[PDB]
Amino acid sequence: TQAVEAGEKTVEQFVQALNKGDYNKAAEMTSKKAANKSALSEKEILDKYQNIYGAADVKGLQISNLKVDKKDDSTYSFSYKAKMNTSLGELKDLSYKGTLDRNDGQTTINWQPNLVFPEMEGNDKVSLTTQEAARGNIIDRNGEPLATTGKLKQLGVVPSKLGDGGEKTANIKAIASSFDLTEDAINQAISQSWVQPDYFVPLKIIDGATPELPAGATIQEVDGRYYPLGEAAAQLIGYVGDITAEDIDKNPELSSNGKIGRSGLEMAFDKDLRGTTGGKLSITDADGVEKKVLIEHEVQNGKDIKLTIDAKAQKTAFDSLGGKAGSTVATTPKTGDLLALASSPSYDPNKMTNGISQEDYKAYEENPEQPFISRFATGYAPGSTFKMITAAIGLDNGTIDPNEVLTINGLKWQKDSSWGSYQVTRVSDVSQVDLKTALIYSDNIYMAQETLKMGEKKFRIGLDKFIFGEDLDLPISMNPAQISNEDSFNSDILLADTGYGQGELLINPIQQAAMYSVFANNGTLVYPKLIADKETKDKKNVIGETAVQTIVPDLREVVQDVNGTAHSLSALGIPLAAKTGTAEIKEKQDVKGKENSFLFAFNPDNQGYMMVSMLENKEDDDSATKRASELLQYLNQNYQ
Ligand SMILES: *C(=O)[C@@H](NC(=O)Cc1ccccc1)[C@@H]1N[C@@H](C(=O)O)C(C)(C)S1
């Protein structure tokens, strides 16, 4: 019992060496190459573990139920049970054994072939057969293909079949012109280091119709991941990439000859879409004689995933942005089904997963407008659209009277002289301003005064009833919305700015569509829902039904009144309640000052659809309201 404590330490740090991937240090703990001692030499153990554990991708060796006893003068036999993770799953209830040798003060392990796998004898071998699982598709709310694995048409060139001299140079340009490609890229692809005279070197992928084939234009049909919408759903869906040797080290259950999701839903749902690798891990002997099977299970394909996205609304919402920086969120506000999650500018997913020239990948990483960003998940300042929330709070606590008319003179205003030179500004010079007039002309001075009148304490009481600080249940990485940096404004100026959607507010378009969903459910907040089978979670009594019955009729006038900020939408001739708004951004990249246009709109008759569009760093005379008539028409007669 005095040396058994050091004997259990020997088995403890031996399994730790195997579990740490260091087989050399694990071999140094064995005895000497003899009949009853260790059965192999030093490097003979290193090569035995590395070839077997490396082939099956063995990682995570845990042991339990140790029992170290005695038998002879130095033969203290040990036995335990272990578990490990391989390419085909987890090995459980592995009964191990062996003996020890405690000569002097160094207790070693009499190594035996049963220490690699339980039922391995003298010179036994291990074999692994695996069949990769097909990746499941991603479908929309109507079963349309958003991310399937289909057949593609390739285009490559063989350097020998290009001619026999100067004819190759002319055809290198004839192939570049017949398929719209760079002539310098064809002669560069055929002159790489790995290129051989008769090797089929690929080029680009034919999108559909195959043009005339010049002097050697082989079209080898290949299979790969295909995204039918392309850039329209690039940020949402994502892209898959080839699996690296360092990826298998983290999760050994991945097929090294397969694809892994790198961003978006392809990554957030990688476990459900890749399936499980099938095959058999058996122990053989001599000439592949199947002795004992360790693991063997059938191949399971990936589960298809149905979203709440409308493929037609996703493409229309993206195309309406015209390639400018922005995003659009369209939902069914009574259930939360996100019908479209567009972001612009965007990248090409089919180009990323099917091989992209590194010059073009630098264009996406160095693009100032950042096409990789999912702008529907990026927190912004909500802008003038946030006055709906501030007004609804003011009506609930009785601070704002819908019929009380404030008298505002000029375009600038400040509470006292303690504000220095800062003044709340408004665009229109209306003298008599009530709640109806302030929401039509988008008056900041009215909301600023009614916010200071409301008080900081009473303001947050209504704000805390929303989703500020909450993390929504969506497979989209985002930060929770915040009222301010700290839990206290500690500034009258900051309180007024937060009244009309400025200050230290950060709300992403998905969270905005959730907070604004109360105006379509009579004060009940409906959480957004991306997976089609998810339940409809809601949160009632956020604002009173009285404030909804007061603001919603006013939001109709933002469209119908001749001086409304969203009057251009009255041309649609459909029932609409909207609320526009810009937002000042003082980014230090330039001394100008970028501003972001916003737009919120929904149908007040049936509450069938709700839309939140925005334009980041908008161009002059451009607005989200201008480029919203297209999908507002679609959402009107398709989601009533
Ligand atoms: C709401 O965000 C308001 N805008 C501002 O406070 C900043 C601003 C930016 C550019 C010009 C003027 C003022 C008002 N809402 C928007 C809108 O509803 O589009 C206005 C441009 C009417 S100012």
Side-chain angles (χ1 to χ4, degrees), residues 1 3-4 6-11 13-19 21-31 33-36 38-42 44-58 60-66 68-69 74 76-82 84-91 94-101 103 105 107-130 133-150 152-160 163-171 174-179 182 185-203 206-211 213-217 219-220 223-241 243-249 251-358 360-361 363-365 367-403 405-411 413-415 417-470 472-534 536-585 587-589 593 595-620 622-640:
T1 319
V4 185
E8 297 192 3
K9 282 190 56 182
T10 302
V11 186
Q13 61 201 241
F14 172 75
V15 181
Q16 173 181 332
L18 294 179
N19 191 20
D22 194 317
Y23 306 112
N24 195 324
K25 185 180 295 182
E28 300 174 358
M29 305 187 50
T30 62
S31 305
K33 183 170 55 184
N36 295 317
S38 76
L40 292 177
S41 177
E42 208 83 342
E44 296 178 348
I45 297 309
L46 195 159
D47 298 359
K48 196 62 181 297
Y49 275 117
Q50 186 184 322
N51 278 269
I52 297 180
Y53 282 176
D57 292 326
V58 173
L61 213 180
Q62 281 76 29
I63 58 181
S64 58
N65 198 332
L66 184 59
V68 179
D69 312 71
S74 298
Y76 283 13
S77 58
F78 70 100
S79 60
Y80 59 89
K81 186 163 297 183
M84 55 178 56
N85 187 20
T86 59
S87 302
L88 293 178
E90 194 85 13
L91 267 172
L94 288 188
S95 301
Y96 280 1
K97 50 181 58 182
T99 49
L100 297 178
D101 180 64
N103 290 336
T107 302
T108 54
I109 305 183
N110 297 335
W111 194 94
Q112 283 300 122
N114 60 77
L115 302 191
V116 184
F117 282 133
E119 251 59 48
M120 274 189 54
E121 296 176 350
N123 196 110
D124 292 4
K125 312 168 184 177
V126 190
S127 65
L128 177 56
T129 288
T130 50
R135 170 172 274 261
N137 303 339
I138 303 180
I139 55 181
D140 78 328
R141 64 190 298 103
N142 294 324
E144 305 294 337
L146 289 184
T148 64
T149 305
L152 307 175
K153 248 172 176 180
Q154 205 178 113
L155 170 57
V157 286
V158 182
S160 61
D164 216 308
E167 185 218 315
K168 150 215 57 183
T169 304
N171 286 272
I175 296 178
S177 298
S178 300
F179 306 103
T182 306
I186 295 183
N187 297 278
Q188 179 183 346
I190 67 181
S191 61
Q192 301 184 57
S193 60
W194 59 270
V195 180
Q196 296 305 310
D198 292 357
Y199 275 13
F200 171 79
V201 175
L203 306 176
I206 295 183
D207 55 353
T210 52
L213 307 178
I219 309 298
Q220 289 193 2
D223 287 0
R225 197 61 157 175
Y226 176 76
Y227 307 96
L229 275 191
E231 308 184 345
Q235 288 82 5
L236 176 59
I237 299 304
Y239 71 102
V240 296
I243 306 187
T244 66
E246 303 186 6
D247 274 320
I248 309 293
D249 187 72
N251 184 23
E253 309 185 28
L254 308 171
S255 185
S256 68
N257 193 18
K259 292 293 185 178
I260 183 180
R262 296 302 186 180
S263 70
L265 294 179
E266 289 278 32
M267 172 183 173
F269 287 145
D270 195 64
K271 187 178 182 180
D272 309 2
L273 287 172
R274 71 176 178 261
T276 58
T277 304
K280 169 177 57 183
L281 177 69
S282 54
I283 302 179
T284 64
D285 61 302
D287 300 313
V289 189
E290 183 175 340
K291 269 183 54 183
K292 181 180 181 180
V293 187
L294 299 170
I295 302 183
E296 179 181 14
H297 73 277
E298 243 279 322
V299 47
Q300 290 180 307
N301 305 275
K303 306 303 155 220
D304 278 18
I305 298 181
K306 171 167 288 186
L307 305 165
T308 60
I309 298 293
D310 191 333
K312 216 166 304 177
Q314 179 76 15
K315 197 177 74 66
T316 297
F318 179 82
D319 294 358
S320 288
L321 296 191
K324 315 298 179 183
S327 64
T328 308
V329 177
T331 65
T332 58
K334 289 187 273 66
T335 64
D337 295 52
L338 300 112
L339 309 177
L341 284 176
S343 180
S344 187
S346 184
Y347 58 90
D348 192 1
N350 304 324
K351 191 177 181 181
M352 292 283 293
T353 182
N354 302 332
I356 176 179
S357 58
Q358 200 171 359
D360 296 331
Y361 182 82
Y364 294 167
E365 282 266 307
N367 193 313
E369 280 187 330
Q370 292 277 7
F372 286 168
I373 296 188
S374 301
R375 283 177 170 81
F376 50 85
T378 304
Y380 296 110
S384 270
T385 71
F386 198 72
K387 297 172 184 177
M388 308 182 310
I389 301 300
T390 304
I393 293 175
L395 302 184
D396 290 353
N397 51 26
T399 305
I400 298 182
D401 181 20
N403 297 329
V405 176
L406 276 64
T407 299
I408 305 178
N409 303 324
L411 299 180
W413 176 91
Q414 62 179 14
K415 173 187 284 186
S417 54
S418 55
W419 284 20
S421 59
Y422 179 79
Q423 303 206 75
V424 179
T425 319
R426 61 178 191 172
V427 292
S428 52
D429 197 337
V430 178
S431 181
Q432 307 301 322
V433 181
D434 59 322
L435 182 60
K436 179 195 188 68
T437 303
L439 288 176
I440 290 176
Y441 292 82
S442 196
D443 194 307
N444 300 274
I445 301 186
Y446 177 85
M447 301 307 301
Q449 293 192 13
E450 294 297 322
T451 302
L452 299 172
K453 173 186 176 182
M454 189 185 307
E456 176 181 353
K457 169 182 171 58
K458 205 177 304 177
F459 189 23
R460 277 202 164 90
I461 294 177
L463 285 172
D464 298 333
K465 279 186 283 293
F466 283 90
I467 61 174
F468 282 94
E470 302 179 0
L472 308 178
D473 180 18
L474 295 175
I476 298 180
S477 187
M478 66 181 63
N479 282 266
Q482 68 167 17
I483 298 178
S484 53
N485 289 331
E486 312 290 341
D487 290 357
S488 180
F489 291 109
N490 292 122
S491 183
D492 297 4
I493 295 182
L494 183 55
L495 180 60
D497 293 11
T498 316
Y500 53 92
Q502 299 286 162
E504 299 176 359
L505 277 174
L506 289 179
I507 316 171
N508 56 72
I510 294 178
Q511 290 172 328
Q512 295 190 36
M515 309 197 323
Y516 296 160
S517 64
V518 295
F519 299 97
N521 298 270
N522 294 274
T524 298
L525 199 154
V526 177
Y527 287 96
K529 172 209 306 175
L530 184 51
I531 306 304
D533 56 74
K534 282 289 184 177
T536 302
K537 179 187 177 183
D538 59 75
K539 175 182 179 182
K540 313 190 66 178
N541 293 333
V542 179
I543 55 172
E545 194 176 11
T546 304
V548 173
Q549 287 297 298
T550 306
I551 295 183
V552 174
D554 281 331
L555 301 180
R556 295 174 172 269
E557 286 291 303
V558 186
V559 185
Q560 295 300 327
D561 194 305
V562 62
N563 288 331
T565 54
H567 182 65
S568 56
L569 298 185
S570 59
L572 296 165
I574 61 179
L576 265 182
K579 176 55 185 173
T580 71
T582 54
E584 222 68 35
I585 294 299
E587 197 173 22
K588 277 306 198 304
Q589 300 185 10
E595 58 191 50
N596 310 328
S597 179
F598 294 85
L599 170 60
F600 158 77
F602 74 105
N603 195 316
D605 294 5
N606 50 21
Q607 299 85 24
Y609 63 92
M610 177 170 295
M611 174 192 179
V612 175
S613 172
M614 72 94 59
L615 265 62
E616 183 187 19
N617 187 18
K618 75 175 192 60
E619 302 179 344
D620 290 0
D622 205 1
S623 65
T625 314
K626 183 185 305 178
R627 43 178 87 256
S629 59
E630 200 179 3
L631 70 148
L632 275 177
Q633 277 167 314
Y634 176 86
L635 291 174
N636 183 76
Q637 65 170 349
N638 279 285
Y639 291 86
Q640 298 177 339

Short mmCIF file of all heavy atoms in Angstrom, two decimals, residues 383-384 427 442 444 565 580-582 584 595, ligand 1:
data_model
loop_
_atom_site.label_atom_id
_atom_site.label_comp_id
_atom_site.label_asym_id
_atom_site.label_seq_id
_atom_site.Cartn_x
_atom_site.Cartn_y
_atom_site.Cartn_z
N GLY A 383 -32.98 55.83 -34.55
CA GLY A 383 -33.38 57.04 -35.24
C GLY A 383 -34.76 57.53 -34.85
O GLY A 383 -35.28 57.20 -33.78
N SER A 384 -35.37 58.31 -35.74
CA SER A 384 -36.65 58.93 -35.46
C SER A 384 -37.79 57.89 -35.35
O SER A 384 -38.87 58.26 -34.82
CB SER A 384 -36.92 59.98 -36.53
OG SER A 384 -36.40 61.26 -36.16
N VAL A 427 -36.67 69.74 -38.36
CA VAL A 427 -36.58 70.09 -39.77
C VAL A 427 -37.69 71.04 -40.22
O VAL A 427 -37.46 71.89 -41.08
CB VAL A 427 -36.56 68.82 -40.64
CG1 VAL A 427 -35.27 68.05 -40.43
CG2 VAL A 427 -37.76 67.94 -40.32
N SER A 442 -42.21 64.46 -37.93
CA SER A 442 -41.05 63.95 -37.21
C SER A 442 -40.32 65.10 -36.50
O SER A 442 -39.22 65.52 -36.87
CB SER A 442 -40.11 63.18 -38.14
OG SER A 442 -39.20 62.39 -37.40
N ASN A 444 -38.39 66.56 -33.44
CA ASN A 444 -37.54 66.13 -32.34
C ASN A 444 -37.74 66.97 -31.09
O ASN A 444 -37.59 66.46 -29.97
CB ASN A 444 -36.07 66.16 -32.76
CG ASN A 444 -35.79 65.26 -33.94
OD1 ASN A 444 -35.54 64.07 -33.79
ND2 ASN A 444 -35.82 65.83 -35.14
N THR A 565 -43.77 62.31 -43.74
CA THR A 565 -42.42 61.96 -44.16
C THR A 565 -42.39 60.74 -45.07
O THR A 565 -41.43 60.58 -45.84
CB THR A 565 -41.54 61.71 -42.93
OG1 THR A 565 -42.15 60.73 -42.08
CG2 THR A 565 -41.35 63.00 -42.15
N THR A 580 -40.70 56.96 -40.67
CA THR A 580 -39.34 57.03 -41.19
C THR A 580 -38.41 57.65 -40.16
O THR A 580 -38.81 58.01 -39.05
CB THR A 580 -39.30 57.82 -42.50
OG1 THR A 580 -39.52 59.21 -42.22
CG2 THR A 580 -40.39 57.33 -43.44
N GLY A 581 -37.14 57.79 -40.53
CA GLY A 581 -36.16 58.42 -39.66
C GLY A 581 -34.73 58.26 -40.13
O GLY A 581 -34.33 57.18 -40.57
N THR A 582 -33.96 59.34 -40.04
CA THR A 582 -32.52 59.29 -40.27
C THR A 582 -31.80 59.24 -38.92
O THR A 582 -32.42 59.19 -37.86
CB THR A 582 -32.07 60.50 -41.10
OG1 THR A 582 -32.52 61.70 -40.47
CG2 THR A 582 -32.66 60.42 -42.50
N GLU A 584 -27.79 60.53 -37.21
CA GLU A 584 -26.46 61.09 -37.40
C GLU A 584 -25.41 60.16 -36.81
O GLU A 584 -25.56 59.68 -35.69
CB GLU A 584 -26.37 62.48 -36.76
CG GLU A 584 -25.63 63.50 -37.61
CD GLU A 584 -26.39 63.86 -38.88
OE1 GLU A 584 -27.64 63.89 -38.83
OE2 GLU A 584 -25.74 64.09 -39.92
N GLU A 595 -24.86 59.42 -42.26
CA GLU A 595 -26.20 59.32 -41.69
C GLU A 595 -26.93 58.13 -42.29
O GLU A 595 -26.78 57.84 -43.48
CB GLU A 595 -27.00 60.62 -41.90
CG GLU A 595 -27.17 61.04 -43.35
CD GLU A 595 -27.73 62.45 -43.47
OE1 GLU A 595 -27.17 63.37 -42.82
OE2 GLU A 595 -28.72 62.65 -44.20
C1 LIG B 1 -35.16 61.56 -36.64
O1 LIG B 1 -34.24 60.76 -36.71
C2 LIG B 1 -35.01 63.00 -37.10
N1 LIG B 1 -33.68 63.26 -37.61
C3 LIG B 1 -32.67 63.75 -36.78
O2 LIG B 1 -32.83 64.01 -35.59
C4 LIG B 1 -31.34 63.94 -37.49
C5 LIG B 1 -31.40 64.58 -38.86
C6 LIG B 1 -30.67 64.02 -39.89
C7 LIG B 1 -30.71 64.60 -41.16
C8 LIG B 1 -31.49 65.74 -41.38
C9 LIG B 1 -32.21 66.30 -40.33
C10 LIG B 1 -32.17 65.72 -39.06
C11 LIG B 1 -36.09 63.38 -38.11
N2 LIG B 1 -36.61 62.23 -38.85
C12 LIG B 1 -36.13 62.26 -40.24
C13 LIG B 1 -37.05 61.39 -41.04
O3 LIG B 1 -38.13 61.09 -40.46
O4 LIG B 1 -36.63 61.07 -42.19
C14 LIG B 1 -36.09 63.71 -40.75
C15 LIG B 1 -35.10 63.94 -41.90
C16 LIG B 1 -37.47 64.24 -41.13
S1 LIG B 1 -35.45 64.61 -39.30
#
